Every structure is written in C-alpha cells, then in structure tokens.
Structure 1
Amino acid sequence: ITGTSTVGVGRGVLGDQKNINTTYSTYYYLQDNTRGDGIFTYDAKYRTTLPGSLWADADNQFFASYDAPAVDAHYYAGVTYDYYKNVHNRLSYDGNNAAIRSSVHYSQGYNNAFWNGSEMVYGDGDGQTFIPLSGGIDVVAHELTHAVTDYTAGLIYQNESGAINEAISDIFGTLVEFYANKNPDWEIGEDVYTPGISGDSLRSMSDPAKYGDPDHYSKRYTGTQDNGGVHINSGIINKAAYLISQGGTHYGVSVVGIGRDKLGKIFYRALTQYLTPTSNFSQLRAAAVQSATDLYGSTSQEVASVKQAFDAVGVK
C-alpha cells in the first residue's frame, strides 16, 4: 500500500482504547510504516487461506467487535519490534528490518496462534477455552520470537531443541510483557485463556508444575506426543530462567536472583551466538554460562546464578 502515514484509534480484545499506526490510500489500512519495512495486519475472514486481505477500514476508527483482534495483533507487533530494537538492538526478526505480517480471524473457533515460517496467525478461540489470541501481549511476543529463533539458532521443533525453542519464546514473551508494563507476571496466556475462570493461565514459569509441567529434568516427558513434549519440557528451562531472574530455593538448591534485564541479555546472547539447530538442554547450559562469562566475567555472581539455576532443575 502506497499512501499517507496517519494514526487511527481502536479498542482491543480486552476493551482497552489504543492508537495504532495506519496508512491512508482511499481506505485506511493496518500498515505501519514507522517500523522497519512495515507492520501489516490481514483479515483471514474465518478461512484458512493465508494471508487474506490487507486490513481496510473506511474511517480510521476500529471500535467494532470484529476489529478488536486486528487492533491488538497490529499494536502488539509494534511493541515487540520496539522491544527488540531498543533493548537488543535487533531490527525486526531477521535483523534487517523484514516486514512483519500477521493474519487474524483465522479459521472458525481456532484455539491457537502460530508463526508459520513466514507470518503470524491468530485464531479467535472458541469463546470459552480462549478469546482471540492476539489480545495477549505474551502470546504476540512468543510468536515473533519464534521468527527470531528461526533466523538465528534455528532450533529444530522436536525433542530437546524444540523445548528450548518453546522456552525462548516463553522467556522473551514475558520480558516483552514486563517491558510494556502491561500487568506483567511469569504466567503465560493469562489474558486470553478461559475467560470464565480467573487466576489461571496456560503455563506457568514460576511454577510449571501447577499445570502439570515438569520443573525438574528427572520429570522430563520421554514420549512422542507434542513433538516429543516441546510444550511440556519447556517447563524445565522456564523454571531455570525464572530462578536466574528472581532467585529462590528449588529442590534444596539456592539461587540468587540477577534480575530481568540480565536474564534477557544472557538468553539473547546464547540464542544469537552459541545455540545451533540441534542443541540439547546440556548445550543450552554451556551456552548460557559462556554468555554470562562473556558479559560479566567468570568469577561473576551472574555466572554463579546461571550454574545454580541449571543445577536446581537438574540440567548438569
């Protein structure tokens, strides 16, 4: 779309009012020219054919219920682009300002969201298990981070490396939730999961076990479903990351917390410089240790909390 950059206003999935970056050319489109090669949001119109139509609105006001999910996918991808740029000096997912695209209203009552190797896709949920998935900033950033991983370490989506891939996405979506200061926590998908039940979430980083996920390597899932438990075993790494940041005693192993920022800096560095497609949990530990050493010194407290955290979850 070639046209004039402007700013529209809308209401998100959660009923919150926000300004969004649009483009004007007869209609107002969901195309933000202010970030890299642009952020583009599409209408999949309850179908599965992608991407669908670039989103067009006649008056630059996005207050209809059908508008909600596009408003949030659009604004949240903006915030995520900004977090990567500002905090890690990464320009978009490929580091070269690749255009970011998302499709909303994908299929009918689709209870998921995913990065497909080329764009982000969000279901509207069935209204009970989930509300439209783009209404959660941790979900949006989890997605975008899979793009980041794809262009860097390239972690294969199965077994150990796949759980690492899932963990990285969970870690960075929570760091983005904190960055935006959007009621942050160490829970995943809380904003959009089971609209009728308060207080739950899909996964927990603080206590993976609360939902049945392992919090220790000895409790790892060895099976076959979920690509070998990519969404299951990610709980062992999530808990490790939560401890480095926040600290605590887990299974009798004490970890002093080094905080969020440092957590993000060590993870980012591990991801972009030391992890490979086939990296396992033990290699992630070596990666994290080496990053923290690069950054803070071998004898640092930082290096100390990273070894403790992994020893707490039985990795190493």
Structure 2
Amino acid sequence: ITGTSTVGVGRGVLGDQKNINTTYSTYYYLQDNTRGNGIFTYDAKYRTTLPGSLWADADNQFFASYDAPAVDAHYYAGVTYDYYKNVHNRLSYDGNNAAIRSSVHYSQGYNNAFWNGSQMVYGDGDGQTFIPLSGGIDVVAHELTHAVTDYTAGLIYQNESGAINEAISDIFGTLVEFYANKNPDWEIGEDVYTPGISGDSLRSMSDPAKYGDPDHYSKRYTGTQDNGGVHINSGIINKAAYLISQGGTHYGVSVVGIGRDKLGKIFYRALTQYLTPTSNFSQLRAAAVQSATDLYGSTSQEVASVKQAFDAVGVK
C-alpha cells in the first residue's frame, strides 16, 4: 500500500517487546518500507490460501496474542535482510531488493514453516510440539535462506544436493542468530520447539547425533523418506561447518577453528559462485576449498581447516 512510513511497537511470541516498521494509510500495515522494495507480513487467518491479507492494525500497537507471530515474522525478516546486506553485500534474496513476504497463522495447529518459491509461511504450532514458528530467528533465517539458495546455486531438493540445501539454511540461520546476538547457539529451533521441555531443539549442528542425525558420511541415510533424507543428512554438513568455525576433534580428526565470520564468508562464496543445482557432498568440499583459497590463499590455515573438517565427517 502507499502511505507514510512509521514505527509501531509490539510483543513477540516469547513476550519480548520490540519496535517494527509499519506503514500508515487509514490503518497501520505490517509493511516495512526501509528495506529494499519492502517487507510485507500477511494474515492467513488459519486458512491455507496464500498470501492472505496484508496485516492491518488500527492503532500501531501489536500486543494481542494473535499479533505476536506477525510481529516476529516481520521483525526477524528485517534482521535477516540486514544480515545479508551488511555482511555479504547482498540486497534481499535475489540480489536486487525483491520484496520479502511472509504469511502467519497458516492453517490450524500447523507444526512447520516453509519457503514456497515466492514467500515464507509460518504455522502456529499445536502448542505442545511447537509454538508459532516465527518466534525463532534461526527458523526465519533458515526459511529466507532457502530463497537465497533458489536464486543462486539452485540446489535441487533431494538426495545430497537437498541435504546441502538444508545445511546451508541451518548454517545461515545460525549465523543470523549470532548476528542478532539473542541467546545464540548451534541448535536449530530451540526457541519454538517443545515449550514443555527445556534444553532440546529440532536439530543440533554441534552434535547432530543427539537427535539421531548422522555426523559422518558413513552413517548417511540412503532411503527415500524426507526426499532422500534432506533434513537428516544435512547433519553431516552441519557438523563440518561447526568444526570449521569452532574447532574440535571428531572421529579422531582434529580441526583448528577459524570462527563464524570466516565460515560465513566461505560458504557464501561457495553458494553464490561455485555450487550448482546437482552438486553433491564431494562437490561441496571442492567448492568450499576453492572459496577459502580465493579468499585467504592456498597455503592458509583457513583452507587447511576446511579440509580437516570434511575429512573429519568423511567427505572426500
């Protein structure tokens, strides 16, 4: 909508207060005009028809329980845009400031979120397995990173290229969580998963096997479920990325860590310059080696740590 940019206030899914960029034209809309061609948040009204209605509010205050997922989807989309722009000099998911759209209150008791090729979609959860999924910044950045992958490498969503697709979204989800510096960790979804149970999460990057996911190529899943295990075998690449950043000894192989910033630079370059739609894990290794080489030198510690990490998880 056309109108005047302003700033509202609301409460997110976890009860924290925050300011959000809105647009005023009779109503106050969840339209952020300060970032590219805009961040737009929609109400799907418990249906599955998308996008739904642009979120409209009478007084620019968003403290109703029904508002909370909209507040976080809108706010965390902005934070993710800021991450890509300030850290990687990328303007939105397509590199030319495409509008970012999200719908919340999708369906009833829907325990998931997703990028559908054009927009983000967030369920409310059933209140036991999940609370509303936009409450997790790593979840939002995960979904939006899918859009980045779709416009760059284009990894097909099955078998090893799908696992890489998934791992990239967990990696940049986590890096966005560290960038915002709100209780950062190497777990996925801990803020919105199982409100009854502390200390757990959907997946772990530091120790994928905590929840049954492979942490070594020899344990990869070879069946047909989950599009050939795209959310399972991602654990192999997530562990590798954890090792590159933090270091550690894994199946007898020691890796010197180089830190989060360099991890991000290497995987961003690998994604945007070297990976293709059918890249497999072995091709990812070569892309990350070449990326580190480009950035730091063939004899750098950085190239050495990338090699050590993939050796540790058994990717040749």
Q: What is the distance in 2 between the residues matched to 1:27 and 1:269?
A: 42
Structure 1, residues 114-172: CA drift from partner, whole Å, max 9, x if none? 00000000000000000000000000000000000000000000000000000000000
Q: What is the distance in 2 between the residues matched to 1:134 and 1:16?
A: 13
Task: Report how far residue 75 of structure 1 moved.
Answer: 0.1
Task: Report how far residue 186 of structure 1 moved.
Answer: 0.2
Task: Report how far residue 90 of structure 1 moved.
Answer: 0.1
- Unaligned 5+ segments in structure 2 are none
Q: What is the distance in 2 between the residues matched to 1:229 and 1:204?
A: 16
Q: What is the distance in 1 between the residues matched to 2:147 and 2:264?
A: 17
Task: Report how far residue 82 of structure 1 moved.
Answer: 0.1
Task: Report how far residue 205 of structure 1 moved.
Answer: 0.1
Q: What is the distance in 2 between the residues matched to 1:173 and 1:188?
A: 8
Q: What is the distance in 2 between the residues matched to 1:177 and 1:267?
A: 16
Task: Report how far residue 38 of structure 1 moved.
Answer: 0.2
Q: What is the distance in 1 between the residues matched to 2:269 and 2:204?
A: 24
The alignment's TM-score, normalised by the length of structure 1, stands at 1.00
Q: What residue in structure 1 maps to residue 247 of structure 2?
A: 247
Task: Report how far residue 222 of structure 1 moved.
Answer: 0.2
Q: What is the distance in 2 between the residues matched to 1:188 and 1:305?
A: 24
Structure 1, residues 73-122: CA drift from partner, whole Å, max 9, x if none? 00000000000000000000000000000000000000000000000000
Q: What is the distance in 1 between the residues matched to 2:266 and 2:43?
A: 37
Q: What residue in structure 2 maps to residue 90 of structure 1?
A: 90
Task: Report how far residue 211 of structure 1 moved.
Answer: 0.1
Q: How many residues align?
A: 316
Task: Report how far residue 273 of structure 1 moved.
Answer: 0.1
Structure 1, residues 156-199: CA drift from partner, whole Å, max 9, x if none? 00000000000000000000000000100000000000000000
The alignment's TM-score, normalised by the length of structure 2, stands at 1.00
Q: What is the distance in 2 between the residues matched to 1:182 and 1:281?
A: 31
Structure 1, residues 21-65: CA drift from partner, whole Å, max 9, x if none? 000000000000000000000000000000000000000000000
Identical residues among aligned pairs (%): 99
- Unaligned 5+ segments in structure 1 are none
Q: What is the distance in 2 between the residues matched to 1:132 and 1:143?
A: 14
Q: What SS class does the counterpart of residue 105 from structure 1 fall into?
A: strand
Alignment of 1:228-247 (within 5 A): 228-247=228-247
Task: Report how far residue 8 of structure 1 moved.
Answer: 0.2
Q: What is the distance in 2 between the residues matched to 1:89 and 1:280?
A: 27
Q: What is the distance in 1 between the residues matched to 2:130 and 2:236?
A: 25
What is the aligned-residue RMSD (CA, Å)? 0.2
Q: What is the distance in 2 between the residues matched to 1:170 and 1:180?
A: 15
Moved over 3 A (4+): none
Q: What SS class does the counterpart of residue 66 from structure 2 fall into?
A: coil
Q: What is the distance in 1 between the residues matched to 2:177 and 2:315?
A: 27
